[PDB]
Structure formats: structure tokens, C-alpha cells
Structure 1
Amino acid sequence: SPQESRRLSIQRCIQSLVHACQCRNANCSLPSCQKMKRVVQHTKGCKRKTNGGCPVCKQLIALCCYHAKHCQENKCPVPFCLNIKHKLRQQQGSGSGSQAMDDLMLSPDDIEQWFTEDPGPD
């Protein structure tokens, strides 16, 4: 199924995201660690975050929201996860399922563009 490949790509980026948020080795050798650290340091200093119109915060929110549904830690390292878990425990309570029942709202190859074609000089 294409949903398994989609879940695998999203899980690649979610593991890279939680890794990047807990990575005390900052100038790390992992490829997606450095890609996630760029967008995490960006959004922490941003003023147009998803609610406004920022595409990098919105694209980071897509993977952080997919992550937060499954995450169960008291104080997880991901910046948006805590906020998303609080609103989801208030609204949904029971979280989300697996594979065929997941946050399938995005393309798995497009997540690889979100960290390559993001806002900057040209």
C-alpha cells in the first residue's frame, strides 16, 4: 500500500525531528537532524507562524502534529508537540490509530521539499 510508504517517510522525518530537538551534539552528522534544527531554530524566532502565513512553520507543524498524536511523554523535546498534545487531550482525548488510520493530510515526497525549497535568498 502507498500509505505504508507514506507512514515510513513521515516516521523518518518524525524520528529526525525528535532527534534534532534532543540532539546535544548540534553540528551532528545525520542529514535530517540538520534539516530539522534549521526549521526549529527558525520557528522559535518567527512572527508569521502557520496562523499568519509562514510556509516553513506550517510544514514543520504537519510533521509535529502527526508526531504529537502518538507521543505520550510528560515533557517531550519537540517545541510544538507539548501544545498539540494539550489541545488534543482536551479535544480528542483518545489520540489516533496506525497506518490506514493516521494524519494522511500530506505527501511523503513533499516533506523532502519542505526542508530544501523553504524561504531564503536566491
Structure 2
Amino acid sequence: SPQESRRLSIQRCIQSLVHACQCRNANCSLPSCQKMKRVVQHTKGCKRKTNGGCPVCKQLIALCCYHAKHCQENKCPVPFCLNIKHKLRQQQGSGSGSEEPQSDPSVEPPLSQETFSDLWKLLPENNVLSPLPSQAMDDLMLSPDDIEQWFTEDPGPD
């Protein structure tokens, strides 16, 4: 079924992200690795990320949100996963604060979370975690064909 092919394409994209994050070769021969290495390096240096939403940074965070919704690990190889999982828990009452990830200021990540709370404006706040009758809240924001388009349709003047 196309729902399975969609979930599988997203799972391949998540495995591409984990590979690129653990991979130490800038010249790695995988197209999956090269897509995610160039995207994570772009996202780390971009100034448009949350200035109305950069299409690279926004969709990398869409994939990290989808991954964090399935993930349970306390030291996962995905870069945004754990603090996204804290932000997802805060929408369900499993975490505290909104302008902070917890009631304590010393437990915050090295990156200022004013960026993180603005990443939370690029994705819908309720729709993604809304009450559900059957498992579909995952495929809700992705397709099997957009997995390439998000990263390969590089912006330009025309």
C-alpha cells in the first residue's frame, strides 16, 4: 500500500540523517549521506531558518519531529531529536515551561533555545500531536516524493 511506501521512504530519510551524523568522511560516496551532510551543514550556518522559514531547515526539522515522535532514547545520534522530544512532551504535560525546556535554566542545550521555540513556529503546534482514532499522525506532513524535493529544489533568482 502507498502508506507503507511513504513510511518506508521517510524511514530511509531518517537512516540517511543518522548515517550523515555518525559519518566522518566529507567525500562519502552515498547520495543519502551527501544529501544529509550538506543539509545539516547548511542548517548549522543559515540565517533564514526561522525568518519566515527556510525550506531546507524547516523540512529537516519536520523529519526530526517525525523521528522524535517514534523515538524513546536518551542519547540518540539524531541532532535535534532529544530537545524536540522535550518540546513534544511539553505539549502533552510530560514536561514544564514554554520559553524554557524545563523549570531550571542550567539544563538547557548549548544552542540558545530562542531558536528552538522559533523552530516550533515552522511546524503546527497542535495538529501533529492532536487526539487520534487510528495511526496516521506521522504521514500527516510528508510524502514519498517530497523526500528528494525538500533538499534538491535549491532556491534561486528565477
- Give the structure-1-normalised TM-score: 0.82
| Long gaps (5+) in structure 1 | none
Structure 2 CA distance for partners of 1:14 and 1:93, relative to 1, 3 Å: farther
Instruction: Tell me, yes or no, if the aligned pair for 1:70 and 1:96 is still in contact at 8 Å.
Output: no
Q: What corresponds to 2:17 in structure 1?
A: 17
Instruction: Tell me, yes or no, if the aligned pair for 2:10 and 2:144 is still in contact at 8 Å.
Output: yes
| Long gaps (5+) in structure 2 | 98-133
Alpha-carbon distance in structure 2 between the residues aligned to 1:17 and 1:37? 8
Q: CA deviation at 1:39?
A: 0.8
Higher RCO, Cα 8 Å, sep 6+: 1
- Which structure: larger Rg? 2
- Give the structure-2-normalised TM-score: 0.65
Q: What corresponds to 2:140 in structure 1?
A: 104
Which segment is superposed worse, 86-95 or 71-80? 86-95
Alpha-carbon distance in structure 2 between the residues aligned to 1:44 and 1:99? 33
Structure 2 CA distance for partners of 1:31 and 1:121, relative to 1, 3 Å: farther
Instruction: Tell me, yes or no, if the aligned pair for 2:19 and 2:33 is still in contact at 8 Å.
Output: yes
Instruction: Tell me, yes or no, if the aligned pair for 2:89 and 2:95 is still in contact at 8 Å.
Output: yes
Instruction: Tell me, yes or no, if the aligned pair for 2:7 and 2:139 is still in contact at 8 Å.
Output: no
Instruction: Tell me, yes or no, if the aligned pair for 1:66 and 1:102 is still in contact at 8 Å.
Output: yes
Which segment is superposed worse, 37-46 or 94-103? 94-103
Across the two proteins, how many residue pairs are aligned to each other?
122
Structure 2 CA distance for partners of 1:15 and 1:94, relative to 1, 3 Å: farther
Which segment is superposed worse, 2-11 or 74-83? 74-83
Alpha-carbon distance in structure 1 between the residues aligned to 2:81 and 2:64? 6
Q: CA deviation at 1:99?
A: 6.3
Structure 2 CA distance for partners of 1:87 and 1:96, relative to 1, 3 Å: closer
